[PDB]
């Protein structure tokens with residue numbers, strides 16, 4: 001079965017065959033679409049088939065399908081599973097696997113960069129202190145003094161589900177949030193619950209508006225432990241506007257390294273519960289969501305006031321106006337400090353090229369439109385006009401339940 | 411079986427059961443989501459008629475009454491004898507209002523119960539259609555104080571006697587392919603604009619020429635008609651600060667009226683059912699003006715604002731976009747023509763959703779269409795999970811007549 005995808009802005013029509021290799025479910029049925037829904041221990045039995053599918057794809061990618069090396073590897077893995085219930089990936093398979101989980105992440109608009117990923121093998125790690133060291137090395141390497149490099153650090157895979165490695169932080173770097181007794185919130189409202197956990201665990205919170213949270217690392221299923229990332233390793237950018245000299249006085253700044261650390265990486269059926277990864281920001285993530293979401297820093301009004309916009313009636317579009325300036329400032333500040341960042345026009349244009357390339361060479365590119373289209377100026381970016389097909393391919397990055405909800409404290 | 415929908419801005423969670431009454435397919439499957447795709451017999455008829463009548467009588471608190479049963483059998487007999495049936499005026503009105511109520515791609519459904527229905531089922535010719543349409547336009551426009559309305563022409567019979575409004579919207583501007591290779595007017599209507607010429611129309615070769623109606627009655631060939639200029643309310647676009655804006659020579663009509671869809675009620679199909687409401691600012695300022703394939707005016711507005719268009723990161727397109735949209739709303743509001751901004755419209759939809767969930771068990775909604783083309787995440791609907799599914803009565807897309815018409 002072939003599926004056609006059309007771009008209503010250029011009439012370009014693409015054909016998708018890749019979806020035929022989709023196995024996981026989407027959440028949607030032939031009677032309902034859950035496309036806008038945020039989020040809708042294995043056995044030897046279901047493991048080998050998963051390993052085989054992966055290994056077949058791997059050996060096919062290197063043009064060695066059917067080879068003796070390919071057949072031996074399958075027998076080697078099969079024997080290992082029956083012998084230990086699991087199996088270890090070769091370094092080459094790990095790299096291939098991580099890159100493809102990124103390549104398959106339908107909610108990621110920066111996938112044109114997928115083949116450029118530094119993979120740090122932390123599978124020999126055993127303690128939280130070990131995790132800390134690995135993570136600091138990941139941060140310094142990725143930051144690279146502002147010239148960001150994509151990377152991922154992969155810790156030991158899940159075994160019996162009682163010895164999981166987990167990074168309790170949702171992102172390696174994020175600002176603390178504090179609920180005040182008057183009901184207001186200091187810092188990032190999104191991290192209030194995590195911040196409380198850190199404090200309870202022993203963290204001495206400076207209680208500021210931009211306090212870098214400590215790492216809470218869990219190794220081999222043990223109780224998590226706190227660690228402070230060396231300040232000198234956390235690159236930050238003071239936010240100022242190119243024309244509005246008062247912008248700087250808003251006291252705003254943001255970290256330069258976006259690194260998701262709460263997702264699960266699945267390769268050949270194996271589950272890597274601790275796999276922090278990072279790239280570089282698209283301006284709107286900070287300027288639109290982190291700064292202007294009502295449930296985040298929510299700075300629209302203040303910026304609106306300083307600009308002396310007509311805030312009496314929404315139809316003046318004062319929010320829209322302040323939004324553009326804030327995002328202009330974020331981009332400007334980052335480029336000035338020479339910290340990698342990409343605007344939504346560039347990122348979306350590139351994704352389109354990446355997408356078309358993928359249809360031709362791979363037969364498709366699973367993409368989640370709801371997440372791909374930027375949170376501002378939607379239709380003036382090429383992706384808005386691009387029909388997309390969303391389906392799940394493995395290897396992949398998956399969501400997993402927050403650790404504080406499932407962990408058995410020792 | 412009881413799906414939940416969460417708003418990530420307010421943590422409010424709503425439970426949806428209405429979807430359990432869905433009957434039509436969505437285009438998606440457990441293995442693939444096509445949520446972003448633009449277009450994913452007597453024996454067949456009665457069950458449909460039955461489904462409708464049941465919900466109708468249920469709505470009037472007469473479910474399982476004699477009146478209910480009586481009507482059910484009368485239609486039943488009528489179908490068996492005539493191979494179809496006619497809706498009572500009450501059913502027709504109820505059906506039209508609910509088709510709007512079920513339109514998952516419409517953000518303005520909070521207004522659903524306030525719909526003026528014009529029963530044009532007694533129509534028989536193209537001139538009769540022109541007359542009915544002019545009356546609709548005049549009623550809906552109401553001197554700038556817009557009123558939602560729909561005019562329903564004769565239902566389908568044997569497919570060879572279908573009524574159709576060839577235009578996509580009752581009021582749109584023409585588009586012509588110039589020698590330059592460029593396009594004059596609205597690029598989206600180039601093809602239609604030609605079928606008018608090819609049919610007789612005398613195009614003024616302008617940038618904003620109100621197109622002529624191409625009405626098709628009882629299956630016969632379509633005919634042209636010029637909408638009385640005095641009935642087509644337009645708004646000149648001027649910025650409330652950029653006096654130079656006017657020099658762009660931009661204007662837009664005040665009455666948005668989709669005319670190429672098919673209304674489905676109890677199995678019956680109304681192929682010609684033009685309907686109208688009032689604009690949400692972004693429709694004109696973002697899509698009609700700034701879409702690269704439309705009037706694509708971003709660069710022009712950018713230049714006159716003296717913005718650094720060298721690098722995309724200066725966000726000039728974004729800045730210009732906002733002004734262009736501030737102007738649209740400004741002009742309409744100045745000329746006292748009904749219009750709603752994306753902020754107010756979206757806030758209303760959220761309220762409507764909550765009403766629908768607590769009073770009906772849900773509200774089908776297509777997030778991809780509901781979220782405005784600009785400033786997405788600063789509107790409440792961005793953070794609102796939505797379940798999309800098809801309920802009848804409904805408004806469906808249908809093949810352009812010029813690809814099905816046997817002259």
Ligand code: HEM
Nearest residue numbers: 102105107108109110113150151277278279280281282397
């Ligand atoms: C090189 C620069 C990169 C850019 C510009 C890019 C951009 C983005 C953006 C804008 C999002 C949406 C974030 C949000 O709204 O929460 C995203 C999501 C995603 N990206 Fe990328 N990305 C990059 C690198 C990476 C890397 C290196 C990986 C994996 C190795 C990756 C995996 C993903 C995943 C899995 C998601 C969804 C996360 C979630 O569900 O919360 N991205 N990316």
Ligand code: HEM
Nearest residue numbers: 510513515516517518521558559685686687688689690805
């Ligand atoms: C009262 C003011 C109304 C508002 C503010 C509203 C707004 C909108 C908007 C913004 C769209 C998207 C248009 C597009 O992007 O092409 C839309 C679509 C739609 N609306 Fe409404 N609407 C209104 C009245 C109506 C009425 C009277 C009906 C039905 C009788 C209706 C039925 C629909 C349908 C079926 C669609 C999707 C059409 C398509 O697929 O092209 N709307 N509405």
Ligand SMILES: C[C@H](O)[C@H](O)[C@H]1CNc2nc(N)[nH]c(=O)c2N1
Nearest residue numbers: 036037038370371792793794795
């Ligand atoms: C409800 C809706 O799915 C939700 O608000 C989504 C929409 N699109 C998004 N897109 C991106 N990139 N990131 C997000 O967090 C979201 N949130």
Ligand SMILES: C[C@H](O)[C@H](O)[C@H]1CNc2nc(N)[nH]c(=O)c2N1
Nearest residue numbers: 384385386387446447448778779
């Ligand atoms: C490809 C994609 O479905 C398409 O561009 C959609 C997106 N959302 C939309 N939303 C509205 N209201 N109107 C449209 O025409 C579209 N176009």
Ligand SMILES: CC(C)NC(=N)NO
Nearest residue numbers: 258259260278280281
């Ligand atoms: C997914 C994450 C590591 N990258 C970003 N959030 N921005 O690019």
Ligand SMILES: CC(C)NC(=N)NO
Nearest residue numbers: 666667668686688689
């Ligand atoms: C669908 C149409 C009749 N309404 C609008 N496009 N705007 O409200």
Ligand SMILES: [Zn+2]
Nearest residue numbers: 028033438443
């Ligand atoms: Zn779907």
